[PDB]
């Protein structure tokens, strides 16, 4: 079963309790599915966002059509949509209670792998349609190999080491210099200024 | 507006100043570094063996011929013991000085094809070349003796 598996619109056992839109699940760096497993290539999410069944279908169809089943295999690195998003009836005034469950999404944080590919192939053979899918994804995304991912991580480390700026967001925020914690967020003490909402600034050091 | 927004939220001016001040500054390297200071040996042995074995050697520019014309010329040459050879100039250049062929340097430039043999059928070969008024015979060196085309013609006659 090398081809990418079908993803259901909603969990077979639908959720009954409406739950809040905890955007923290999109905010910040991803702590899961950050490393390769049984594969050499992937789509890395350089930003946070919610994946719908439409995005899942786009990924599945594009990758299945463009891959070579006898030499390539793909695997989801993100769970099927589980977080329920509720929408009220069109033109409804505010109030009256939380809306009914409309769709299901799956959160994705910056730095996560969405799909992972492997098999008897090199990067150039796959990067094309992986970049197509990444560009059509709801967040910034990039087709990345193991080598390229390691290269970008090492480049980030090198920039952090050799930056000539005496002042770093990390230092200033941690020391509360200028009292900038009045303007910053508690999440910023760990994001180090590289994250802003759902957006991940990679050039940011 | 929520902390996480679909658009890049506007930062408080002090946060903007912080981000501008804490930008990555790459290290300036003072002086720009830009303006500071198998098969090959197989064919080496092949060329050495060819030079040693052949008693007479000639060269030409058989590049203007069709595939079939070149094949026919090869067949006519194989009718005699002479063998036509193709080698890259890029690796033929060292061989001249390696084998002590100084006068052969200004002779192998561009397409060059060897006509190595021991029994010269040069008379009939020139006859064959005559009906094709091109593909000039190019200078060679029989038995470590450089011959010009006039020398080859005299030797033929």
């Amino acid at each position: 079963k090398p081809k990418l598996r079908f993803i259901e619109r909603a969990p077979l056992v639908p959720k009954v309790r409406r739950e809040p839109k905890n955007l923290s699940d999109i905010r910040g760096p991803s702590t899961e599915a950050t490393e390769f497993t049984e594969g050499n290539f992937a789509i890395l999410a350089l930003g946070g966002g919610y994946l719908h069944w439409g995005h899942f279908e786009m990924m599945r169809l594009t990758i299945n059509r463009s891959m070579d089943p006898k030499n390539m295999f793909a695997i989801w690195r993100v769970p099927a949509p589980f977080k329920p998003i509720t929408r009220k009836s069109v033109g409804h005034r505010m109030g009256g209670g939380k809306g009914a469950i409309d769709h299901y999404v799956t959160p994705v944080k910056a730095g996560r792998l969405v799909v992972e590919m492997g098999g008897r192939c090199e990067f150039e053979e796959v990067q094309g349609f992986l970049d197509q899918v990444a560009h059509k994804l709801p967040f910034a995304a990039k087709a990345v190999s193991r080598g390229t991912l390691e290269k970008m991580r090492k480049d980030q480390e090198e920039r952090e080491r050799n930056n000539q700026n005496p002042w770093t967001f990390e230092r200033i925020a941690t020391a509360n210099m200028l009292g900038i914690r009045k303007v910053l967020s508690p999440y910023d003490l760990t994001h180090k200024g590289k994250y802003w909402g759902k957006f991940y600034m990679p050039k940011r050091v | 507006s929520k902390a996480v927004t679909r658009h890049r939220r506007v930062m408080h001016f002090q946060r903007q100043k912080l981000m501008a001040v804490t930008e990555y500054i790459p290290p300036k390297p003072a002086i720009h570094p830009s303006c500071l200071p198998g098969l090959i040996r197989l064919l080496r042995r092949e060329i050495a063996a060819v030079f040693q074995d052949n008693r007479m050697i000639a060269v030409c520019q058989n590049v203007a011929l069709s595939a079939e014309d070149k094949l026919l010329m090869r067949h006519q040459l194989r009718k005699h013991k002479i063998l036509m050879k193709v080698f890259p100039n890029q690796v033929l250049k060292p061989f001249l000085e390696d084998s002590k062929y100084q006068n052969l340097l200004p002779l192998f430039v561009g397409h060059n094809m060897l006509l190595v043999s021991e029994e010269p059928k040069v008379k009939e070969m020139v006859r064959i070349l005559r009906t094709v008024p091109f593909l000039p015979l190019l200078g060679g060196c029989i038995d470590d003796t450089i011959l010009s085309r006039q020398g080859f013609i005299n030797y033929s006659k």
Partner: peptide
């Protein structure tokens, strides 16, 4: 070995053709 490089060239041509199938 001449045949080694011949097979290498054939495989490289195969790889290029496979890559160009979509191009």
């Amino acid at each position: 070995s001449r045949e080694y490089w011949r097979r290498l060239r054939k495989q490289n041509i195969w790889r290029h053709n496979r890559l160009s199938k979509n191009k």
